Structure 1
Amino acid sequence: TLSILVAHDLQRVIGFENQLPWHLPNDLKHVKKLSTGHTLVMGRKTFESIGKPLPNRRNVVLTSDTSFNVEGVDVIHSIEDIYQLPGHVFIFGGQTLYEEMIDKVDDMYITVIEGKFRGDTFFPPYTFEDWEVASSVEGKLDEKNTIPHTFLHLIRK
């Protein structure tokens, strides 16, 4: 099973200066819950923006760097390698990986952040003509999560 897992704003911003532009604990929980016991595949820049693997799942980094070696991280050097990974694989970012994979994934788990942030990296345009809304769930707005957000599960028609 091949899924995208992304959070993007109203204009599809996903990043600014190698960080996420917003702080949303609800979405971090969502990510942890969805991907625990499974596999994350991410581009080299995305990995480096955090610098350590997320515990309790497989962390896979795509890079052309033949020297890349990080404890608790598995390395791949081709998009083709993704299809050989067993289990439920989540494409975890960043822009380059999403652009390469959006036409290939079975489904998408998207957190829509209902704001407009300054960004330098974007999720690719997509249309609901191509995607069924399996579920759409409003996130809870509170003191620690103060940006409205909606968890979408989209399945390719």
Structure 2
Amino acid sequence: TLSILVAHDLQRVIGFENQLPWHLPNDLKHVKKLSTGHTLVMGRKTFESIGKPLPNRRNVVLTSDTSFNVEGVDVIHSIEDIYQLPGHVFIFGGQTLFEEMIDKVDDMYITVIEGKFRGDTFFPPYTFEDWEVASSVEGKLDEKNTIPHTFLHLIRK
């Protein structure tokens, strides 16, 4: 299975200055639950933002840099390489990867951040005419998680 995993705000903002615009621990819990024991494919900038491979899953980085060889990370140099990866593969960002893959993936696991943030990178437009809502679950708010958010699982029609 090939899936997108993304958090985007009401205007599809996903990033600002190579980091997430929001602090939302619940989204990370969501990422952990979905991707632990599976595979993440990410662009080079996204990887450098995180700074290290995420534990307990396969981390694959897409880059044109032929000098890229980082411990605990597998490297690929083409979109076509993604299709050779076994198991459940999650496209993990950033904007360039999402743009390249939104028409190819089976489904999407979106955290809708129900706010309007300043962004410099965006998730591409999509329409519910193309995507069935498999589930929609409101995130619980507390002291640590103060921005309303909704977890959507969309499946291509």
Query: What range describes the TM-score normalised by the shorter chain of this pair?
Result: over 0.9
* TM-score (ref. length: structure 2): 1.00
Residue 110 of structure 1, CA deviation: 0.2
> C-alpha deviations, 1:108-145, integer Å up to 9, x for none?
00000000000000000000000000000000011100
In structure 1, list runs of 5 or more residues that go unmatched.
none
Cα distance in structure 2, aligned partners of 1:16 and 1:33: 25
State the 1:54 CA deviation: 0.3
Q: Give the Å deviation of 1:69.
A: 1.2
> For structure 2, which runs of at least 5 residues remain unmatched after alignment?
none
| Secondary structure at 1:97 match in 2 | helix
Stretches of 4+ moved more than 4 A in 1?
A: none
Distance 1:116 1:69 in 2: 37
Deviation at 1:74, TM superposition (A): 0.2
Q: Secondary structure at the match of 2:23?
A: coil
CA-to-aligned-CA distance 1:82-127 (integer Å, 9 cap, x gap): 0000000000000000000000000000000000000000000000
Distance 1:137 1:52 in 2: 30
> TM-score, normalising length from structure 1?
1.00
In structure 2, distance between residues paired with 1:75 and 1:137: 34
Query: What is the aligned residue count?
Result: 157
Cα separation, 2, equivalents of 1:153 and 1:50: 24
- Identity of counterpart residues, as a percentage? 99
Structure 1 residue 50 displacement after superposition: 1.1
* 1:72 match: 72
Give, in angstroms, the shift of residue 46 of structure 1: 0.2
Separation in structure 1 between the aligned mates of residue 24 and residue 32 of structure 2, nearest angstrom = 13
| Structure-1 separation of matches of 2:107 and 2:46 | 21
Distance across 2 between alignment mates of 1:110 and 1:30: 10
Q: 1: CA distance between counterparts of 2:28 and 2:99? A: 23
Counterpart secondary structure, 1:52: coil
Counterparts of 1:113 and 1:21, CA distance in 2: 10
Secondary structure, counterpart of 1:6 in structure 2: strand
Task: Give the deviation of 1:79 after TM superposition.
Answer: 0.1
SS in 2 for 1:11: coil
| RMSD (Å), alpha carbons | 0.3
Query: 1:144 and 1:69 mapped to 2: Cα distance?
Result: 36
Query: Could you say what secondary structure the match of 2:27 adopts?
Result: helix
